[PDB]
């Protein structure tokens, strides 16, 4: 039964309002909401209509708050009779709190926290005798008086948190508050107000209960010390991020009656808890994390022996601990521990027979040893934490007693096997046993009532995944992780009733089928398909379907064959290496494509490179190399401005090479074996400044090498056999910067491909090394010996002489300098080189006497010196002897 004037009063503070997020739409003057008890936020007396709860409230959903923006009308006293007025995290006008509410004359709630209110707390807050939880904290007020506190004689709660305060006497008068039991002093400085014992002992008995006293900048024990003298009834203290330091005090034991202690984030809390805390026997929530404890596990436990029932939470996470678990069941009543990030170093036994009642248990990223422990025994858990540990042997089979857990990771220990029993989880929404030894075969009965797994990880484990014919899945899984895994010489025809994978990760298995007809559509959000290193064999034509949320296509090392498959838009690395594809490649560009790798290498393409690569815009890596393709390249391939690395060896293409002058960034160009013709171009030396592999073999170049090729000041390879070049050898080889520092080492030569994938969230990082990518693809020309330090110029028409520059010349590893056109002597001051481990200067017109030094050459490995025109009594050193009749053979020495 509302009476009008409250009503009308309610819809005049709605009217000063502005509230953009659907909050009180249920108010108006509409003839349909006109009873007020319905009202959302208001509450009413049934005996009579008058307002006792306005809570207009909200929360934090993750920060972001749907805060109401308005301006408190005087209305709001035209209610009266009111006795709860909750303002919990809005954002009204961010000004003084206003001066009305003092005249309520009946209020016994007040939560004006987490707003922005500024200013100082009016006086008039005497009048507010009424009062029992006042909760003015974390605003922005400044407090510089409290003498109105004392007439507020009727409180149990005060929270004055986040204030300036500056109260110099603050004890006397908080402590002329006979009824008060809860305090909150968080963030309120409170470390420069420290009460002289003449001020306690000039003070009343009150008997505090509750305190909060975080984010204080106490930093020692002498401090806080006066907590302690209200210790005949204490239960909860917070003592969060104070930057404490030394021992805590040994009187927080004695210390009856507390069920609470929060000492997180502190600076070094040293030695851990001391013997004082046996005689607690009442503890039931004890956080001690980042404190740098430093205590041996069984003294903490035996320590804690006198609150054994009653502990529930305990914390001791992201702090150094050393020992072993053990005899854990004998608590009985705890239920979430959080030992992760310790250095534990120590077994985990029970040894006691009797059961648990652990929901939450978090033993990661610290060392164990030895076997799991009876697992049966922990009815109740329900996420079981144990990865990057040492823990050997199967696990057991009592896993299936557990039938409520619903999160296991058992990733990056040493477990050698998985059980029956496992099957019988039907809670179980992700199961990641990772980089484990889990030797053996999983049959469907290990998998037969897991209805409700969305995340199955059994990533690089030497295991063997066989289910029969006719089983129907019960689960509906997102995320499909099972590399390294045996899957069957067919392909999996449990894939058939899966329908909304995003991730999908059968690479490495053993698969030599034909892809099913039923495998056309890959779900619509789909982030990774991985199929890598397999035997698959069919067409792919038919199953991308340009989604839009494609990161990750690996169909390398397959028995493919068929059309391009479509590259989608949002795809950021698309690998199609080792396969059979065949076709024409023009439909690589029609669409705008962000794929910062793209691999095609080792297949059977053909046709013209389409001029379409101005509309890729992040190729950093192309790798088009062993594909018989033809025709001029395309003048698109100038506009890749992030271009990074480019393979086109061995293709057959033609024409002058166009200009890739904007292709800043560019480290890695070979185009060895095609038929490139044309002279050097001039741009390779003005731009790609960063370049560092170059590799021009087998083409149909000519002219002279010309000097500008020195500016590069990275070069490590320099490729030019077998190419018709002719001239004299550039005389500025020592402006290479890595081959003038012996041991020297350039900047990793790498890219990034990041991303998350998971509702447990996930983290799939690639991490691509170029210079790996040349080592493994130069393992293809030459069996014997490469190396990351060359410079090759053999088997073209140069005339001259070796110029004496590359005496100085410290980290170069090979030289091939052979069927050329050279006349003199060789290099006097070549025993100054130091790693050399190839020397060819063969089928020359090389004129004069080996000189001594080649004898204090050390490492060398191969060397050939055939058909010159030298002198005779080769050195007598260690190594040269070693060599054959071969390398000295064709001389009239
Ligand atoms: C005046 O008004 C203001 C309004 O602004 C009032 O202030 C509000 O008061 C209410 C109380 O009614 C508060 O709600 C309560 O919040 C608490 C705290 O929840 C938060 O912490 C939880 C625990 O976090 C630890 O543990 C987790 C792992 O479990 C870890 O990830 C955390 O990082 C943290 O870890 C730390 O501690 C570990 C163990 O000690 C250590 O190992 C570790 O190293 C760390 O040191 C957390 O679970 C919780 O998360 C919730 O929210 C997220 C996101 O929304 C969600 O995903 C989760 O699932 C959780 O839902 C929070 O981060 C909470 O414990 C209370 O729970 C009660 O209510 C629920 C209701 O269902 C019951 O089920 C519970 O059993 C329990 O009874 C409650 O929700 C509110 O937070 C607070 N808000 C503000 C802004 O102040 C004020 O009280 C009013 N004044 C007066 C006088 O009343
Ligand atoms: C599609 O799927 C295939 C198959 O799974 C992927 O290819 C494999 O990718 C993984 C992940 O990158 C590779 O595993 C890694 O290999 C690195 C190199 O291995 C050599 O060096 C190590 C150390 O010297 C030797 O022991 C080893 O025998 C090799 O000689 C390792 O260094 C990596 O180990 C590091 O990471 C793991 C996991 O974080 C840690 O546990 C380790 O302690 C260490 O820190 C790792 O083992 C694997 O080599 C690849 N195999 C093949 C055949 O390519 C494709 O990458 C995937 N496609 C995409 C796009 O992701
Ligand atoms: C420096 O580069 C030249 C080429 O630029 C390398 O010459 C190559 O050397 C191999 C090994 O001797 C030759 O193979 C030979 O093939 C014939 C058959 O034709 C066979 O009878 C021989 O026994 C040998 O296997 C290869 O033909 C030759 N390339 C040529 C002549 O073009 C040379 O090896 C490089 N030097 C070093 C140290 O690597
Ligand atoms: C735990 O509480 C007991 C008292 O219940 C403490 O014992 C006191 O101190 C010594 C024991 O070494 C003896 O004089 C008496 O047993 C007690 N003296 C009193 C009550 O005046 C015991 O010291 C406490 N534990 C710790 C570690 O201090
Ligand atoms: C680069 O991509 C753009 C956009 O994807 C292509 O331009 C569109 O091409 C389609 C297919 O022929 C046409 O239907 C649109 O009308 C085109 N729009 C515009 C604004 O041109 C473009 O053809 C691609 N580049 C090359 C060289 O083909
Ligand atoms: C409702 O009003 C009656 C008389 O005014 C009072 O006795 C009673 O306590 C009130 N109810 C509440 C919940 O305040
Ligand atoms: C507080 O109560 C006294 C008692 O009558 C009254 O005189 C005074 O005006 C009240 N304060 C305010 C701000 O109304
Ligand atoms: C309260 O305890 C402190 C801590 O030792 C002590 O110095 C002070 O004299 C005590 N005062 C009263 C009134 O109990
Ligand atoms: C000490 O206590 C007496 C007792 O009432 C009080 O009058 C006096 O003001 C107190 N001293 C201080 C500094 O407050
Ligand atoms: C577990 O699987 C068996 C085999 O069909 C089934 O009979 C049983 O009902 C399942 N348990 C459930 C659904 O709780
Ligand atoms: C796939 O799962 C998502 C949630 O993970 C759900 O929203 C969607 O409806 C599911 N798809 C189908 C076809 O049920
Ligand atoms: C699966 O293929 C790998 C490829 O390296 C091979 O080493 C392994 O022996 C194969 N296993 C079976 C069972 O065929
Ligand atoms: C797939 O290709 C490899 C080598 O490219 C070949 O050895 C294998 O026989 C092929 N598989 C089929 C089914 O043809
Ligand atoms: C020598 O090489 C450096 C390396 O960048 C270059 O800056 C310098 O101009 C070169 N000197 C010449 C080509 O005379
Ligand atoms: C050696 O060959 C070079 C070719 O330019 C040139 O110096 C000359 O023709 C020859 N003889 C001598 C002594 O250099
Ligand atoms: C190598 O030996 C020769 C001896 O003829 C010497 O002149 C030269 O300095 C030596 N090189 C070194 C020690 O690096």
């Known amino acids: 039964l509302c009476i009008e004037k409250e009503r009308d009063a309610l819809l005049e503070f709605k009217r000063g ?37 306005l809570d207009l409230h909200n929360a934090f959903t993750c920060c972001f708050a749907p805060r ?14 009111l006795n709860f007025l909750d303002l919990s995290v809005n954002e009204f006008e961010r000004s003084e709190i206003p001066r009305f509410i003092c005249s309520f004359k009946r209020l016994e709630y007040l939560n004006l926290s987490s707003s922005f209110f500024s200013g100082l707390i009016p006086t008039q807050f005497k009048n507010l005798t009424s009062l029992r939880i006042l909760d003015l904290g974390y605003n922005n007020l400044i407090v510089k008086d409290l003498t109105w ?34 305090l909150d002093l968080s963030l309120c400085g409170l470390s420069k107000l420290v009460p002289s014992p003449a001020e306690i002992a000039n003070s009343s008995l009150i008997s505090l209960s509750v305190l909060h006293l975080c984010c204080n900048e106490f930093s ?26 030394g021992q805590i005090d040994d009187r927080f034991g004695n210390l009856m009656y507390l069920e609470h202690l929060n000492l997180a984030n502190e600076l070094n809390l040293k030695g851990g808890i001391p013997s004082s805390f046996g005689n607690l026997t009442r503890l039931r929530y004890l956080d001690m994390s980042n404190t740098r404890t430093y205590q041996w596990l069984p003294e903490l436990f035996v320590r804690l022996s006198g609150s054994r029932k009653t502990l529930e939470v305990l914390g001791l996470n992201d702090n150094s601990m050393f020992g072993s678990l053990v005899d854990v069941t004998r608590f009985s009543a705890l239920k979430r521990l959080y030992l992760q990030k310790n250095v534990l170093n120590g077994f985990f036994m029970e040894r006691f027979g009797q059961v648990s009642s652990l929901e939450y248990l978090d033993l990661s990223d610290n060392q164990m040893r030895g076997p799991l422990p009876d697992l049966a025994l922990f009815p109740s858990l329900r996420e079981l934490h144990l990865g ?66 969305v995340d199955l990880d059994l990533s690089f484990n030497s295991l063997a995944l066989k289910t029969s014919i006719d089983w129907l899945p019960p689960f509906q899984l997102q995320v499909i992780n099972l590399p390294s895994c045996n899957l069957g010489p067919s392909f999996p025809k449990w894939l058939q009733s899966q329908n909304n994978y995003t991730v999908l990760d059968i690479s490495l298995a053993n ?45 390398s090392s397959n028995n493919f064959s068929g059309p391009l498959p479509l590259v989608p838009t949002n795809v950021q690395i698309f690998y199609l290496h080792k396969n059979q594809f065949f076709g024409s490649i023009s439909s690589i560009c029609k669409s705008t494509t962000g794929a910062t790798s793209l691999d095609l290498s080792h297949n059977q393409f053909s046709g013209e490179l389409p001029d379409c690569w101005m509309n890729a815009t992040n190729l950093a890596v192309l790798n088009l190399a062993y594909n018989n393709f033809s025709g001029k390249l395309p003048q698109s391939l100038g506009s890749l401005t992030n271009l990074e690395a480019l393979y086109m060896r061995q293709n057959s293409f033609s024409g002058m090479l166009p200009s890739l002058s904007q292709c800043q960034s560019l480290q890695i160009l070979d185009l060895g074996g095609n038929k490139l013709t044309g002279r050097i171009p001039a741009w390779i030396g003005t731009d790609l400044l960063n370049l560092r592999i170059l590799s021009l073999r087998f083409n149909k170049f000519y002219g002279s090498i010309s000097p500008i090729i020195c500016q590069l000041q990275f070069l490590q390879i320099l490729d030019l056999s077998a190419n018709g070049l002719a001239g004299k050898i550039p005389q500025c080889f020592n402006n290479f910067t890595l081959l003038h520092q012996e041991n020297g080492l350039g900047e990793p030569m790498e890219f990034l491909v990041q991303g998350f994938y998971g509702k447990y969230p996930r983290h799939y990082s690639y991490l691509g090394n170029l210079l790996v990518q040349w080592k493994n693809q130069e393992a293809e020309y030459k069996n014997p010996l490469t190396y990351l330090k060359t410079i090759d110029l053999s088997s ?23 069927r050329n056109d050279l006349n003199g002597s060789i290099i006097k001051g070549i025993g100054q080189m130091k790693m050399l481990e190839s020397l060819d200067l063969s089928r020359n017109q090389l004129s004069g006497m080996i000189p001594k030094d080649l004898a204090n050459l050390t490492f060398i490995g191969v060397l ?8 005779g009594r080769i050195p007598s050193s260690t190594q040269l002897q070693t060599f054959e009749r071969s390398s000295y053979s064709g001389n009239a020495q």
């Open 864 to 871: 050939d010196l055939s058909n010159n025109h030298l002198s």
């Open 220 to 245: 020692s024990s002498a401090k806080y010390s006066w907590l302690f003298n209200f210790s005949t009834s204490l239960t909860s203290i917070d003592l969060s991020n104070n930057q404490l330091d």
């Open 17 to 53: 309002l502005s509230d953009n997020f659907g909050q009180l739409s249920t108010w108006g003057d509409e003839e349909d909401k006109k009873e007020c008890c319905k009202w959302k936020g208001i509450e009413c007396n049934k005996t009579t209509g008058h307002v006792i709860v």
């Open 511 to 555: 698969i030599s089928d034909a892809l099913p007809s039923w495998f056309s559509g890959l779900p619509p959000d789909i982030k990774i398909l991985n199929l890598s290193n397999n035997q698959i064999s069919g067409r792919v034509s038919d199953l991308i379907e340009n989604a839009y949320d494609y990161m990750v296509i690996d169909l």
């Open 68 to 81: 109401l923006t308005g301006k408190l009308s005087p209305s709001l006293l035209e209610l009266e009779y």
């Open 796 to 818: 073209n028409k140069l005339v001259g002489g070796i110029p004496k520059e590359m005496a100085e010349m410290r980290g170069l590893k090979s030289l091939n300098l052979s």
């Open 149 to 182: 506190l004392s007439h507020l004689s009727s409180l149990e709660l005060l929270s004055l948190g986040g204030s300036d305060f500056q109260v110099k006497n603050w004890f006397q008068e908080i402590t002329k508050l006979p009824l008060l039991k809860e």
């Open 388 to 453: 990057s540990n040492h823990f050997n042997g199967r696990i057991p089979q009592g896993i299936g007693k557990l039938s409520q857990l619903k999160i296991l990771d058992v990733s990056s220990n040493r477990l050698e096997g998985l059980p029956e029993s496992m099957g019988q989880l039907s809670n179980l929404e992700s199961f990641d046993a990772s980089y484990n030894v889990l030797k053996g075969t999983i049959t469907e009965s290990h998998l037969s009532n897991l209805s409700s797994l």
